Amino acid sequence: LTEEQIAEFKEAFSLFDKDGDGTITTKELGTVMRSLGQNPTEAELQDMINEVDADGNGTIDFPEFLTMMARKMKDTDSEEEIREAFRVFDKDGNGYISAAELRHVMTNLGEKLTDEEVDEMIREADIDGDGQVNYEEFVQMMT
């Protein structure tokens, strides 16, 4: 891994962490995934957190989250995880995440940020300079 790779993962830890206390439970998984329109089962929640649990205690701190992001589990009928995530952002499915829709996604995840910041983010991912973020640019900022 690298400085920047570890830097993305700190931020992905922070969004699940809800009540603070630097740990993630099966509850924070289930809750944040249901706000993104998913519906986990109690058995499959426990198939995720207790897999990377260690040290006992029942929660996941950042060392654990960090190991998970490298030594992950394998997949089943999955392949296009970038189109599935893109689909979650691009509310009206025209293929272009507007600055407006990015603000909608961040507030549902709990982030209260400046308009200057909302557009700063669009401008980081906007390869062609049209003012919005499309799919072929989303895939590339991932890859």
């Binding site: 993305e8 931020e11 599935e84 979650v88 961040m106 940020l113 900022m141």
Partner: peptide, 18 residues
């Protein structure tokens, strides 16, 4: 605040939740 890492962090949390 860091714009490139706020967007990246939220994209990976969405991928993890999906």
């Amino acid at each position: 605040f860091n714009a490139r890492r706020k967007l990246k962090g939220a994209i990976l949390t969405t991928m993890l939740a999906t």
